[PDB]
Amino acid sequence: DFSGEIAELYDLVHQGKGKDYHREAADLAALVRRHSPKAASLLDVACGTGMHLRHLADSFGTVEGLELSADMLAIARRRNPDAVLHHGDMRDFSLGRRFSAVTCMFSSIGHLAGQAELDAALERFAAHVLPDGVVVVEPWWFPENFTPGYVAAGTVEAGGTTVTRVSHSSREGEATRIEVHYLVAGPDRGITHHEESHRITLFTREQYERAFTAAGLSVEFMPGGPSGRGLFTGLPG
Amino acid sequence: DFSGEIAELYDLVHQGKGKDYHREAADLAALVRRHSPKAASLLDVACGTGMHLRHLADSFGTVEGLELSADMLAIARRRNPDAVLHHGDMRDFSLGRRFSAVTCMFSSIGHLAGQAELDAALERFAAHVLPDGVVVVEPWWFPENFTPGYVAAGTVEAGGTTVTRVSHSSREGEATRIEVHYLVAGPDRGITHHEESHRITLFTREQYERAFTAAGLSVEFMPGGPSGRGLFTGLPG
Ligand SMILES: Cc1cn([C@H]2C[C@H](O)[C@@H](COP(=O)(O)OP(=O)(O)Oc3ccccc3)O2)c(=O)[nH]c1=O
Ligand SMILES: Cc1cn([C@H]2C[C@H](O)[C@@H](COP(=O)(O)OP(=O)(O)Oc3ccccc3)O2)c(=O)[nH]c1=O
Ligand SMILES: Nc1ncnc2c1ncn2[C@@H]1O[C@H](CSCC[C@H](N)C(=O)O)[C@@H](O)[C@H]1O
Ligand SMILES: Nc1ncnc2c1ncn2[C@@H]1O[C@H](CSCC[C@H](N)C(=O)O)[C@@H](O)[C@H]1O
C-alpha cells in the first residue's frame, strides 16, 4: 500500500530522482494524438498523486483518474481540483463512459498478482477506450531484464525537510521484493524512520501480450520508454 | 557508547565527511615540535579507531593510545599493530610514564559530564605530559556557538556497501543531544537501520580554562581548528 508518509513523500522522492512528469505527459499526449487525431479525453489508471494528469489536463479537455489508495488520491485531487478522480480498483471498475486513451504508468500494473488479474485489468482498459483510441501500459521489468541485488540511495531537501531514501530489490519467486527505507529529518522534527515493502510481479513480455490480445487489443512493445522498462500500446480491433 | 555497528561504520562515515586525519596529524606533530623540539612520544587519549595515531607514528618513535570503548580500541589495535594501545578511562588512568604530548581530539572531552570530570581528566593529562611538552584538547562547541536544530546528511559507498547517515542536534539543558540514524545497504545484506544518541556537554570556554589551570597548565585557545571548534593547548608550569 501507499498510505500515510509513503504517500506524503512520494512526489518529493521522485522529484529528487529526476522523474520528469511534464516531459512524460507531453510524450504521452503526442502518442495518443498520433493514433487518435481528434482525441479529447484520457483516463489515467493507478494515477497515484496525479502528476501526469496535471500536465495532461493542459492538452485534453477531459482527464479523469482511477486510484485505489485514498491517501494517494487525496493528493491527486488537490493537485487536480477541476478533474473527476475516482476511487477504485483497476481490476474491476466501471465508469460508464469511454476515453480516447486509457493509461497505466510507472509499472503500477506490476501490483497485479498473476495472469487472471492482468487479463481482468486489460479487459477493463479495453472496456473504457474508444475505437480509434489507445491503451498504454508501462510494464514492470521482464524477468530476463530484472537486476537482483540492486540498491538505490538518494537524498533530497525541501522546505527544511531532508529525506533520504534507500531501496533494495531481490527476486522472490515470480516477483521482485522491493524494500524501501526512509530517514526524514528536520530542525524541529528530529529524525524519523519509515519502511515499506512491495511485491511487484515479474510478468513476461508474452504474458502482457496475452492480456492485451484477450481484451481485443492489438499490442506493440517499444523498448526504453520513460523508465527503461519500455512501453506497451494497444489498439482496439 | 561506540560499540557494534557504530564502531564498524565510524571510519567510513568520517571518510565520506572528508575528515583528513593525515593532515590533522601532520599539523599536530608540527604543533608538538614547536613547543618540544626533541619530542619523541605522544599519548592520544580517547583515540577511537586510531586514525590520528597511525599517522603520528610516522613522526614519533613512541605513540600510545587510551580508549574506553573495547570495540573502537579493537579497530585501533588492528590499524596500529606495533603500538601499545591501552584500555581505560580518561577520567582516571595511570600509565606510569610521561609523553611529549597528550592529545584528546575531535571533542571527545565533551563526553565528560561536568566540571569535576573535566578537571579530573585535565589533571590526568598533566600527570602524563613532560615539562617541555604540550597537552592538546579539541573542545566541543561553546554554548554561544552551538547551532540547535542542525541536520547533517550524507551517503558513502565502499566495497559494495552503501551507508547513509543523518544526524540531528538539539539543546538539552547544559548539553547537546545528538541523534544519529544510519541505513546500511548492500546487494546481499538488504537494508538495516541503526540508531544512536549522545549527550555532549556544552562546557563554556571559561570551564575549559579552569580545568587546565587547576591541572597546573597554562592555557591558550586557537579558533578554527580541525573542526571549526578551535583547539586548546596547555603547557606545564
Ligand atoms: C536499471 C535496472 C533497474 N532495475 C530495477 C531494480 C529496482 O527494482 C528498480 C530501480 O529501483 P528504484 O530506482 O528504487 O525504483 P523506482 O524508480 O521504481 O522507485 C520505486 C520502486 C518501488 C516502489 C516505489 C518506488 O529497477 C532492473 O530490474 N533492471 C535494470 O536494468
Ligand atoms: C557548523 C556548526 C555545527 N555545529 C554542531 C551541530 C552538530 O552537532 C555538529 C555537526 O554535526 P555532524 O556533522 O553530524 O557532527 P560530527 O562531525 O561531530 O559527527 C558526529 C557527531 C556526533 C557523534 C559522532 C559523530 O556540530 C554547531 O554547534 N555550530 C556550528 O557552527
Ligand atoms: N488494483 C489497483 N487499482 C488501482 N490502483 C492501484 C492498484 N494497485 C496499485 N495501485 C496504485 O498504483 C500506484 C503505483 S505508483 C505509480 C503512480 C503513478 N502512475 C505515477 O506514475 O507516479 C499507486 O498509486 C497504487 O496505489
Ligand atoms: N571517559 C572516556 N575515556 C576514554 N575514551 C572515552 C571516554 N568517553 C568517551 N571516549 C571515547 O571518545 C571517543 C569519541 S569519538 C573521537 C575519536 C578520535 N579521537 C577521533 O578523532 O576520531 C570514542 O572513541 C569514545 O569511546
Side-chain angles (χ1 to χ4, degrees), chain A residues 1-4 6-7 9-33 35-53 55-205 207-209 211-221 223-237, chain B residues 1-4 6-7 9-33 35-53 55-205 207-209 211-221 223-237:
Chain A
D1 76 321
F2 284 79
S3 66
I6 296 165
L9 294 165
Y10 184 90
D11 291 329
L12 182 61
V13 154
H14 292 288
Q15 177 166 225
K17 284 169 90 66
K19 191 164 176 67
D20 187 346
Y21 287 87
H22 171 222
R23 193 46 56 204
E24 290 185 21
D27 292 341
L28 277 177
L31 174 53
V32 171
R33 286 186 171 102
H35 298 289
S36 181
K38 296 201 293 311
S41 61
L42 182 148
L43 172 64
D44 190 32
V45 175
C47 61
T49 63
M51 287 289 287
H52 288 116
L53 279 168
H55 294 290
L56 291 163
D58 290 333
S59 185
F60 295 103
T62 297
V63 301
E64 297 184 15
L66 183 75
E67 176 48 61
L68 189 54
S69 166
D71 286 349
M72 296 289 276
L73 176 59
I75 298 169
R77 283 173 172 168
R78 292 203 289 266
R79 174 165 286 129
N80 298 278
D82 298 321
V84 177
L85 303 190
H86 306 273
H87 184 256
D89 191 327
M90 77 172 82
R91 293 170 288 176
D92 201 341
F93 67 101
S94 187
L95 306 180
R97 60 157 295 161
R98 298 174 175 266
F99 301 78
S100 322
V102 180
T103 59
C104 184
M105 302 306 292
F106 204 28
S107 314
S108 187
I109 199 83
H111 289 286
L112 304 180
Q115 193 74 46
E117 289 191 356
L118 187 64
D119 285 356
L122 263 295
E123 185 279 332
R124 294 289 78 205
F125 299 173
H128 289 83
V129 72
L130 289 169
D132 303 295
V134 59
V135 174
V136 180
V137 174
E138 184 177 2
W140 184 235
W141 299 102
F142 303 144
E144 47 262 56
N145 303 133
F146 176 56
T147 51
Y150 193 96
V151 172
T155 297
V156 62
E157 189 272 332
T161 300
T162 303
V163 177
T164 288
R165 179 194 182 266
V166 181
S167 72
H168 174 271
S169 296
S170 57
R171 182 72 170 257
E172 195 181 75
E174 305 164 338
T176 301
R177 171 65 55 187
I178 182 145
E179 188 172 346
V180 185
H181 288 238
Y182 301 83
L183 302 170
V184 182
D188 287 339
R189 183 188 189 94
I191 303 164
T192 60
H193 174 242
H194 313 267
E195 55 182 287
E196 77 181 326
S197 198
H198 299 283
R199 186 168 163 82
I200 312 295
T201 300
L202 286 162
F203 290 116
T204 68
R205 179 171 171 176
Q207 286 183 285
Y208 290 108
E209 289 172 349
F212 274 82
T213 301
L217 302 166
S218 75
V219 64
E220 174 177 345
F221 180 68
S227 311
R229 301 157 203 178
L231 196 69
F232 286 100
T233 60
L235 303 181
Chain B
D1 76 321
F2 284 79
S3 66
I6 296 165
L9 294 165
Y10 184 90
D11 291 329
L12 182 61
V13 154
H14 292 288
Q15 177 166 225
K17 284 169 90 66
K19 191 164 176 67
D20 187 346
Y21 287 87
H22 171 222
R23 193 46 56 204
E24 290 185 21
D27 292 341
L28 277 177
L31 174 53
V32 171
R33 286 186 171 102
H35 298 289
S36 181
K38 296 201 293 311
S41 61
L42 182 148
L43 172 64
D44 190 32
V45 175
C47 61
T49 63
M51 287 289 287
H52 288 116
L53 279 168
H55 294 290
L56 291 163
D58 290 333
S59 185
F60 295 103
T62 297
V63 301
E64 297 184 15
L66 183 75
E67 176 48 61
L68 189 54
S69 166
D71 286 349
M72 296 289 276
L73 176 59
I75 298 169
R77 283 173 172 168
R78 292 203 289 266
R79 174 165 286 129
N80 298 278
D82 298 321
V84 177
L85 303 190
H86 306 273
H87 184 256
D89 191 327
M90 77 172 82
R91 293 170 288 176
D92 201 341
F93 67 101
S94 187
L95 306 180
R97 60 157 295 161
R98 298 174 175 266
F99 301 78
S100 322
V102 180
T103 59
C104 184
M105 302 306 292
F106 204 28
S107 314
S108 187
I109 199 83
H111 289 286
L112 304 180
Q115 193 74 46
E117 289 191 356
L118 187 64
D119 285 356
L122 263 295
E123 185 279 332
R124 294 289 78 205
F125 299 173
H128 289 83
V129 72
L130 289 169
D132 303 295
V134 59
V135 174
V136 180
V137 174
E138 184 177 2
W140 184 235
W141 299 102
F142 303 144
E144 47 262 56
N145 303 133
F146 176 56
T147 51
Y150 193 96
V151 172
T155 297
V156 62
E157 189 272 332
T161 300
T162 303
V163 177
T164 288
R165 179 194 182 266
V166 181
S167 72
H168 174 271
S169 296
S170 57
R171 182 72 170 257
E172 195 181 75
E174 305 164 338
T176 301
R177 171 65 55 187
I178 182 145
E179 188 172 346
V180 185
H181 288 238
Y182 301 83
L183 302 170
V184 182
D188 287 339
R189 183 188 189 94
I191 303 164
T192 60
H193 174 242
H194 313 267
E195 55 182 287
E196 77 181 326
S197 198
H198 299 283
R199 186 168 163 82
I200 312 295
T201 300
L202 286 162
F203 290 116
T204 68
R205 179 171 171 176
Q207 286 183 285
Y208 290 108
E209 289 172 349
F212 274 82
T213 301
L217 302 166
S218 75
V219 64
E220 174 177 345
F221 180 68
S227 311
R229 301 157 203 178
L231 196 69
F232 286 100
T233 60
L235 303 181

